[PDB]
Coordinates of C-alpha atoms and ligand atoms in Angstrom, one line a residue:
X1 CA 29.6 -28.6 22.9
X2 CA 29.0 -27.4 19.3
X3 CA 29.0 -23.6 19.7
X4 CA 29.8 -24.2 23.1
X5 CA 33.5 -23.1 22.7
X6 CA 34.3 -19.8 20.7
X7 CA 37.5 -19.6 18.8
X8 CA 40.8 -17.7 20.1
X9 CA 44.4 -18.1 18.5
X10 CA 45.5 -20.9 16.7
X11 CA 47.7 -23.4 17.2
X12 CA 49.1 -25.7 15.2
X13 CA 47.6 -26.7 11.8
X14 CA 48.8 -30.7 11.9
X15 CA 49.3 -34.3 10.2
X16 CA 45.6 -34.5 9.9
X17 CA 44.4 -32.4 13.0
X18 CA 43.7 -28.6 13.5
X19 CA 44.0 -27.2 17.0
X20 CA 42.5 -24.2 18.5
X21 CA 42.5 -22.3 21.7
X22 CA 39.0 -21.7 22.6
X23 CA 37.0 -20.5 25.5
X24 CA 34.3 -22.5 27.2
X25 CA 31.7 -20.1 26.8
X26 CA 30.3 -21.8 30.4
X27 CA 32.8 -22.5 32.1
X28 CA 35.3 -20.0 31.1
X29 CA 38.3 -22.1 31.0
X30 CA 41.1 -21.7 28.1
X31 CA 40.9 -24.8 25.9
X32 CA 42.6 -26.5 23.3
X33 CA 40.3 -28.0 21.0
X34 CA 42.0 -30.9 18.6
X35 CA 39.9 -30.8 15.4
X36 CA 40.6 -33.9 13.4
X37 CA 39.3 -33.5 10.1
X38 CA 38.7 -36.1 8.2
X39 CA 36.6 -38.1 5.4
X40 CA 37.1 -41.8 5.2
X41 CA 36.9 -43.6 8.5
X42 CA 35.9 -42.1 12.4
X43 CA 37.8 -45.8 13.2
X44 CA 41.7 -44.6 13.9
X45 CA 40.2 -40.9 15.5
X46 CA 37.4 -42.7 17.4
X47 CA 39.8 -45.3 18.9
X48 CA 41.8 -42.0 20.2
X49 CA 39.3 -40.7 22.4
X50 CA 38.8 -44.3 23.6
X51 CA 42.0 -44.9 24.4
X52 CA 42.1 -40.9 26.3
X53 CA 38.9 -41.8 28.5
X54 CA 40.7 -44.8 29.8
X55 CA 43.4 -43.0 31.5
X56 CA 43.8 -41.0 34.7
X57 CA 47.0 -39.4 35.3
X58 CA 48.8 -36.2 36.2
X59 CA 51.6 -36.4 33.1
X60 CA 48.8 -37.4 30.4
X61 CA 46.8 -34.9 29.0
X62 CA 43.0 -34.8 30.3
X63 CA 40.5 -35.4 28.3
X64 CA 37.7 -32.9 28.7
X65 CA 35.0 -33.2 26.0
X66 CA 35.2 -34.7 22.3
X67 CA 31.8 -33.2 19.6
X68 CA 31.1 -32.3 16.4
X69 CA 29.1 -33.9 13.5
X70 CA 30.1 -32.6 9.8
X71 CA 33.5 -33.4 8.3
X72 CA 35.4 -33.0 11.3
X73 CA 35.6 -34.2 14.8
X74 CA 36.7 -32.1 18.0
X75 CA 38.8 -33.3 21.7
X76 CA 38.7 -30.8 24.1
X77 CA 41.3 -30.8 26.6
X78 CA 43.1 -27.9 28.9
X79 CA 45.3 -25.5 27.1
X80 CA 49.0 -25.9 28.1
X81 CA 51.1 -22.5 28.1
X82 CA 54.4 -24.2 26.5
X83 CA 56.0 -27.4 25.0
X84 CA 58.9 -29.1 25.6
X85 CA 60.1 -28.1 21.9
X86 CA 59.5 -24.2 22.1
X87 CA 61.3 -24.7 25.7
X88 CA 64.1 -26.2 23.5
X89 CA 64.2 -23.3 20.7
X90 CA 64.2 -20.2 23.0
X91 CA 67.5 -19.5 23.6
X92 CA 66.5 -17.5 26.3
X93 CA 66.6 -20.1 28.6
X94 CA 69.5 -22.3 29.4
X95 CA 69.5 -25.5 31.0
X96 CA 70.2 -26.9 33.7
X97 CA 70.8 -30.2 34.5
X98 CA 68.2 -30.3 37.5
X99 CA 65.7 -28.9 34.8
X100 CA 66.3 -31.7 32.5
X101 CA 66.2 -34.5 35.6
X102 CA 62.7 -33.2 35.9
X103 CA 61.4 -32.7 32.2
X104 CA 62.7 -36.5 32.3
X105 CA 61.1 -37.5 35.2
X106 CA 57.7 -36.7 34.4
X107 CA 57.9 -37.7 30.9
X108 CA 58.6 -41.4 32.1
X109 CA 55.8 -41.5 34.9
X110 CA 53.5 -40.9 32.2
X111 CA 55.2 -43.5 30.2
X112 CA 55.8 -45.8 33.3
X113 CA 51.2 -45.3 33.5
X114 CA 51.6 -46.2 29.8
X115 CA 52.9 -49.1 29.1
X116 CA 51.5 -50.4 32.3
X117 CA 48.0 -49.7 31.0
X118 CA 49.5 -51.4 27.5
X119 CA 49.9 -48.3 25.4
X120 CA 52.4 -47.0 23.0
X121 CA 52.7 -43.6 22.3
X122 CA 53.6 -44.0 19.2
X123 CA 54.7 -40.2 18.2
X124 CA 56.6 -39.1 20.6
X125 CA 58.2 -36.4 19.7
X126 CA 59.4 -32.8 21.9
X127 CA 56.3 -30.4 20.4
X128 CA 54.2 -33.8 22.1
X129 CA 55.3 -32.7 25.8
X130 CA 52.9 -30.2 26.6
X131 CA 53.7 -27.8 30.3
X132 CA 51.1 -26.1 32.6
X133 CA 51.9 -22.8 34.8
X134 CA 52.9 -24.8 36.9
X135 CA 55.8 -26.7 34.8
X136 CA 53.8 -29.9 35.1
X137 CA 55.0 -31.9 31.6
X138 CA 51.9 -34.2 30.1
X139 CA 52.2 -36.5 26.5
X140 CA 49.5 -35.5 24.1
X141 CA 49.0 -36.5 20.5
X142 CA 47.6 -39.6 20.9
X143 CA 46.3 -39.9 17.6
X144 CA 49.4 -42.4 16.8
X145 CA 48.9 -44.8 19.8
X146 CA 47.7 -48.6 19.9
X147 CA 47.2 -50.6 22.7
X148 CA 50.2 -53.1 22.8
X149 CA 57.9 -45.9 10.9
X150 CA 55.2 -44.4 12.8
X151 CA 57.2 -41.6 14.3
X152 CA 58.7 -38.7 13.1
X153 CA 62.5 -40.0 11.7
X154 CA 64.5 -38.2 13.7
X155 CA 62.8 -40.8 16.9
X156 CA 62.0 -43.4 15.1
X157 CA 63.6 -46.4 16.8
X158 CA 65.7 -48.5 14.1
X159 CA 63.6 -51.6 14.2
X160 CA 60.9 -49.5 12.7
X161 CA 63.4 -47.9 10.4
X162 CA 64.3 -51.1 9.2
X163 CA 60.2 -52.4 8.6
X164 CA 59.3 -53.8 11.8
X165 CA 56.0 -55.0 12.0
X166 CA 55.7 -56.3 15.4
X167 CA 57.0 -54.0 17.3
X168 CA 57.1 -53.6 21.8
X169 CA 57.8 -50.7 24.0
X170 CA 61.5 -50.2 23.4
X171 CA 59.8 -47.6 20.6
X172 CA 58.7 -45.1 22.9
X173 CA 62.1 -45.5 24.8
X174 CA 64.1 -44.8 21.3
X175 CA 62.2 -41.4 21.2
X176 CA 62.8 -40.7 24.7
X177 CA 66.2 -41.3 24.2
X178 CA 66.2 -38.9 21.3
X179 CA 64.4 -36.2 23.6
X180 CA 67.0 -36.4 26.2
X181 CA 69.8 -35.6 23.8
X182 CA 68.0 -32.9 22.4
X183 CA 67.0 -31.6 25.6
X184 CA 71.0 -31.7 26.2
X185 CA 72.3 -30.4 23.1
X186 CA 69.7 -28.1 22.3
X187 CA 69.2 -29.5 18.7
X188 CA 67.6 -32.8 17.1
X189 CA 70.3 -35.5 17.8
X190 CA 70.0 -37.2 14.7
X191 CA 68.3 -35.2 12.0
X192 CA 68.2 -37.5 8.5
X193 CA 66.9 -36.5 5.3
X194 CA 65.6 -39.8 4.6
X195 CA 64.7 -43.0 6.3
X196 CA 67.6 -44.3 4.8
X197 CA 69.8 -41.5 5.6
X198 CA 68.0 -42.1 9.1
X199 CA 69.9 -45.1 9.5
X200 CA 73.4 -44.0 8.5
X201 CA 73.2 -40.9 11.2
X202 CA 71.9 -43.7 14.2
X203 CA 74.9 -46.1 13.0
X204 CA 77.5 -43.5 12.2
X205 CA 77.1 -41.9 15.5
X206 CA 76.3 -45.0 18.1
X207 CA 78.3 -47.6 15.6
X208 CA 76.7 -50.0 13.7
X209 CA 75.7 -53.2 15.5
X210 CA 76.6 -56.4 15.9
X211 CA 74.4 -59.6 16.0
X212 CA 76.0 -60.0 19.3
X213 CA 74.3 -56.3 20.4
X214 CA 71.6 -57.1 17.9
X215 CA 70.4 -60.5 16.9
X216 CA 67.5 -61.4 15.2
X217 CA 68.6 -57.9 13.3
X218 CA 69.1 -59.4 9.7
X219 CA 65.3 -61.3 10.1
X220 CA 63.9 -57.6 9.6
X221 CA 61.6 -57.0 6.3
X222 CA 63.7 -54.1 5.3
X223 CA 67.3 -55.0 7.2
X224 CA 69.5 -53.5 4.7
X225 CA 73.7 -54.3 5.1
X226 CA 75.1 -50.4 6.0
X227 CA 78.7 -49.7 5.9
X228 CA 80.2 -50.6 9.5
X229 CA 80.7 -47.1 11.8
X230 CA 83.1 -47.5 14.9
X231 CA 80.3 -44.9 16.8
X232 CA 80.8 -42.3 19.3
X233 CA 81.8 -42.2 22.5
X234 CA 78.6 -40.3 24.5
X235 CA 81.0 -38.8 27.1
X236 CA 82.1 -36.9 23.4
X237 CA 78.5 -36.3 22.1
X238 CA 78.2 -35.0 25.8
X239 CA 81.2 -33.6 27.6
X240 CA 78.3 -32.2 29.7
X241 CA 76.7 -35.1 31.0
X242 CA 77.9 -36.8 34.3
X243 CA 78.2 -40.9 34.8
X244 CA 74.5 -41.7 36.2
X245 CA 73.2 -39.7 33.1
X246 CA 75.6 -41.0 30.7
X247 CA 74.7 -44.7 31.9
X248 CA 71.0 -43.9 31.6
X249 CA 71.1 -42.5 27.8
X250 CA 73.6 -45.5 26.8
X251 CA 70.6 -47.6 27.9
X252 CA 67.9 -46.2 26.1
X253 CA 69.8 -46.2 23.0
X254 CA 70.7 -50.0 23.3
X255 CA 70.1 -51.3 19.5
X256 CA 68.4 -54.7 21.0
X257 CA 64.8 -53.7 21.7
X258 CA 64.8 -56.0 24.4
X259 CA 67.7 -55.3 25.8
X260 CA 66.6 -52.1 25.5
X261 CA 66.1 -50.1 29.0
X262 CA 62.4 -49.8 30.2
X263 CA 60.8 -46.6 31.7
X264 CA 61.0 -48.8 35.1
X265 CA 64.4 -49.9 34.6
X266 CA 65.7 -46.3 33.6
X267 CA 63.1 -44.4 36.6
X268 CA 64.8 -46.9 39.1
X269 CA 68.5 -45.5 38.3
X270 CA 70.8 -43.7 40.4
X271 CA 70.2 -41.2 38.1
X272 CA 67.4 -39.6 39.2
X273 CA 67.8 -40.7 43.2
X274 CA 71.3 -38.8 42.7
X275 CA 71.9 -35.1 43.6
X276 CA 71.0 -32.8 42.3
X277 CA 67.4 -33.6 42.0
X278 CA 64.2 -32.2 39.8
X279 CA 63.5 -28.5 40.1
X280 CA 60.0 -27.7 41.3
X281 CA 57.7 -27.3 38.0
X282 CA 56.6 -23.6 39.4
X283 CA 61.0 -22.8 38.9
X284 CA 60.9 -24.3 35.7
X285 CA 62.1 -22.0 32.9
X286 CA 59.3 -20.2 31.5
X287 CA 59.1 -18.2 27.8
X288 CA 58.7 -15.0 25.8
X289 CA 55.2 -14.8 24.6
Ligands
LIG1 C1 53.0 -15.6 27.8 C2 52.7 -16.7 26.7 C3 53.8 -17.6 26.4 O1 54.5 -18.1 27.4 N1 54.1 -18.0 25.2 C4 55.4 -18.2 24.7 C5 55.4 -19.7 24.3 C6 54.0 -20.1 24.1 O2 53.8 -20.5 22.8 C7 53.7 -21.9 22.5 O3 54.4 -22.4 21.7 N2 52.8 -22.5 23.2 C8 51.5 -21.8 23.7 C9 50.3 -22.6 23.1 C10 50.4 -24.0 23.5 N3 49.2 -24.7 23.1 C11 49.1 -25.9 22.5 C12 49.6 -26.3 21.3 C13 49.4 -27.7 20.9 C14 50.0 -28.1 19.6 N4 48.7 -28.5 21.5 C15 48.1 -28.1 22.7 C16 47.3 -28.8 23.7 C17 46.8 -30.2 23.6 C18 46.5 -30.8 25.0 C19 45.6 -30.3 22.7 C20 47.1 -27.8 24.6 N5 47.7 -26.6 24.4 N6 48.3 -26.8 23.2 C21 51.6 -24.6 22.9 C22 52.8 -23.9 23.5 C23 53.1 -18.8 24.4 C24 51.8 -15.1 28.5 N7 52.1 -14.2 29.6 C25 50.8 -13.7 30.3 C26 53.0 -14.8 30.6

């Protein structure tokens, strides 16, 4: 499983992870090997295949074969032609809202699996939502990912934002949240240029909460007292989207992280038993190349 695989394109140098398409020189599939290269511990990168093994699913990513004794440390898994996040940036496509009811839908079965098997995913992110030929979605970099400011700031729930050490689900709904209005408006919804500036683009644009919306928000290590933001109406933020949709983002973007909108909760909304529903994967919008 060493020489096993020989190298074709890269693709993506990473946080502390290289990742290479490969060939199985056996079986000749296309691969994507995850090198995690590392020194010190292989604790955090061992637990990751650990936690992989442990789950069967259609939206999680399969793995195939982890290897490799020097500095590094190699996961095999099947190559994926796009991600949600290239989907985003090529303006080639448009979107439809039947496309986006079914990059949704499969993101939260796989999160539904999740969380039901006590996981967080803690990085979600778009470039994280990996698509087959046949537009079937799957979560990947599990490398951030315990089992019951991690993330990337621009989905990093506000509880974290603010120093949250104990921390539930409602984390991996923030980022799905985020995801959703960046699949809508085509660009990151709230891009700061520092955790602190983070906080002031969440507030400014959803309004800064109350202890009514948020109690127990002041009893955070790093709450910090932000100037007080009316918000935004989301019917303004999106003039596209109609009132199942609008009722389902308004949920996942609830400030109280228990009051925050599950992936059960939000998969058992009208939204997504309301016309119309999810395109087939196959007529899912494909890319360039
Ligand atoms: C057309 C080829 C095509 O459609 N391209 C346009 C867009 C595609 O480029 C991408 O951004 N891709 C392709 C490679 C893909 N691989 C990838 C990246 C990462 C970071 N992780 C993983 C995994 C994990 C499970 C490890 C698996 N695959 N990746 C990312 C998206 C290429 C071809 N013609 C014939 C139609």
């Amino acid at each position: 499983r060493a020489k096993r695989y020989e190298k074709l394109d890269f693709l993506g140098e990473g946080q502390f992870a290289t990742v290479y398409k490969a060939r199985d020189k056996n079986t000749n599939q296309i691969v994507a090997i995850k090198k995690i290269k590392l020194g010190h511990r292989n604790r955090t990168a061992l637990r990751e295949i650990k936690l992989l093994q442990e789950l069967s699913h259609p939206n999680i990513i399969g793995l195939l074969d982890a290897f490799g004794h020097k500095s590094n440390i190699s996961l095999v898994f099947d190559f994926m032609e796009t991600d949600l996040e290239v989907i985003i940036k090529d303006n080639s496509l448009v979107l439809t809202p039947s496309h986006i009811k079914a990059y949704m839908l499969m993101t939260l079965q796989g999160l539904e699996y999740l969380h039901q098997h006590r996981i967080l995913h803690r990085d979600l992110k778009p470039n994280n939502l990996l698509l087959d030929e046949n537009g079937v979605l799957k979560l990947a970099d599990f490398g951030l990912a315990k089992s019951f400011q991690v993330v990337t700031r621009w989905y990093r729930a506000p509880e974290l934002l603010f120093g949250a050490r104990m921390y539930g689900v409602g984390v991996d709904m923030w980022a799905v949240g985020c995801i959703l209005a960046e699949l809508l408006l085509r660009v990151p919804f709230l891009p700061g240029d520092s955790d602190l500036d983070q906080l002031t683009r969440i507030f400014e644009t959803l309004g800064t909460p109350t202890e009514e919306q948020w109690p127990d928000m002041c009893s955070l290590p790093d709450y910090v007292t932000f100037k007080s933001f009316p918000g935004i109406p989301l019917h303004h933020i999106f003039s596209a989207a109609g009132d199942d949709l609008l009722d389902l983002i308004q949920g996942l973007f609830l400030f109280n992280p228990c009051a925050r909108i599950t992936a059960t909760q939000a998969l058992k909304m009208k939204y997504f038993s309301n016309r119309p529903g999810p395109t087939p994967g196959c007529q899912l919008p494909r890319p360039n190349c």
